[PDB]
Amino acid sequence: QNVGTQAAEEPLNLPISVCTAPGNCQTEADAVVLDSNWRWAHTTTGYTNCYTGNLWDTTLCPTPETCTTNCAIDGVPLADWSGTYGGSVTGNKFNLKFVTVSTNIGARTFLLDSTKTRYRMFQLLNREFTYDVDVSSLDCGLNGALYFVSMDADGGAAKYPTNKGGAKYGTGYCDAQCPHDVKWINGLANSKDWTPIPGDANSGKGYYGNCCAELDIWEANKQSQAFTTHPCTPNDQTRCEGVVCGDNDSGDRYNGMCDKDGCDFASYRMNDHTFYGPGSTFKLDSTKPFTVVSQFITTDGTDNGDFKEFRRFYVQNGVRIENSKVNFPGITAYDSITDEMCAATKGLFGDLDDHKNKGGMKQMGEAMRKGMALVMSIWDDHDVNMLWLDSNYPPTGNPSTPGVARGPCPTTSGVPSEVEVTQANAVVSFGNIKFGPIGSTV
Structure with missing residues (x-):
């Protein structure tokens, strides 16, 4: 995408901590950028929308190449973060509102480094990544997610010269679902064969998907939570079409380049229904904030070893809480991903x-x-x-x-039209992010 001139891009400042030992951390002055899908797309030399509701303008975008020449994505000014997109920061806490009323539904954001020109890339092997979360206002049907993907640090700018914005404009999103709903892929509008998603006034699907490896730290609401590994072959950002995307709709979920299911550890699914839930007698009380600690263990305990284990524990109100365990007859009581x-x-x-x-x-x-x-x-x-x-x-x-x-959610739950009314004011908070050697973040 070209970059528009109507509004400066102003990411939200978000300090994190980089740690060397327990309680010995230094501030890293990072920031949060909005994904390019949520940006206004308009003519490069004007105000005319190239995309409105869930459709590209067919006169401006008869082909992806023409669309890309004619159109540009614009910046998010500071005032619009809260007013339009439902994003805000207080100190080291980042808040994302689900519905913001001209009516915005959901949000995806990325961490920029201290220069605010590249994504903050985390080399996670033999490290610990930790944050505080509040999902108390998220119920059945909603997901406040924190995760890592194999995006390029510059959002693809170096690979795709038609991508003028790079990480600064939240470009280059890919994940292990090889999503077709990404509006800009490989520096080009994904406008070919664009199809609105029925019952989604803001979204559609284009010809291409965008695949890459994904490490889910946190897929959650107050009822259930999971962490999940999704490798791909290869792992790096890969535009896909046909069978390579592993599209659900063509029966190709298991025929593509990415592991779409992933290997999940989800406490409730692993048959501990009392570990996590909205109340004080669950082991981990989702009505209150808590700390989520993730440790990425290698074969030799060094940065050069192979990834062997994703370990997890929690801290809530100063109480250390070890992960739940797999609970089925004849199955080892695993408490980690291996x-x-x-x-x-x-x-x-x-x-x-x-x-x-x-x-x-x-x-x-x-x-x-x-x-x-x-x-x-x-x-x-x-x-x-x-x-x-x-x-x-x-x-x-x-x-x-x-x-x-x-x-425990009913199978009738989570209909977007219903949750967008009933949970309009849901807000996820992610805060006090800490990164360092194993054992350094609490």
Whole structure:
């Protein structure tokens, strides 16, 4: 995309901590940038929309190349962050409102480095990543997500010279779902064969998808939470078409370059329904804030080893809370993501181990070694109504069959039109982000 001249781009300042030992950290003066999908797209030498509602203008965008020549994405000024997009920062806390009323629904954002010209790339192997979260106002059907993806640090600017904005304009998004709803891919409008998504007034799908590796630290609302590894072959940003995208709609979910299911550790799905929930007698009380700690263990305990284990623990009101465990007869009580856990649990659930097909923890680790961009988002799910996260999936499945039940939400929950009314004022908060060696962040 070209860059427009109507509004300066002003990312929100967000300090994080880089740590060397427990309680010995230094501030890193980073910032938050809005994903290019949420930006106004208009004519390069005017005010005329190139995209309105869920459609590209066919006169301006008869082809992707013409669209890209004629159109530009514009900046987010400071005033518009809260007023238009529902984003705000107080000290080291970042807040994202779900619906902001001209009416904005959801948000996806990235962490910029201290220069505000590149994404802050995190080399996560043999490191610990930690943050405080509040998901108390997110119920069934919503997801306040924090995760990493194998985006380029410059959003693709060096690879795709028609991308003028780079990381500064939140470009280059890709993930392990190979999404077609990304409006700008490889420096070009994804306007070919663009199709609105029914019941989604703001979104559509273009000819291409954009694939890359994804490490989900946090997919969650107050009812259920998960962390998940998604390797791809290769891991780096890859525009896809046809079978390579692994499109759900053509029966290709397991035929593409990315592991779409991922290998998940989701406490409720692993059959501990009392670990996490909205109340003081759950082990971890989702009505109150808490700290989420993630440790990425290698084979030799060094930065050069292969990724072998994703460990997790929590801190809430000064109380250390170890992760829940897998709880099925004849299955080891795993409390972390490893290749063995993935094989054993997917075996039990009858899920295809595409994680293993894509190179497993080792391949996931190669993405983490090269460095990944931090994503913070809030969203509802127009495909599957978040049932995969917090309900029975498939909805018609027996909840006593291992793998089906992922949370207590009813199978009628999560319809975007309903959650966008009922949960309009939901806000996820991510704060006090800390990064360092294992054992350094609490």
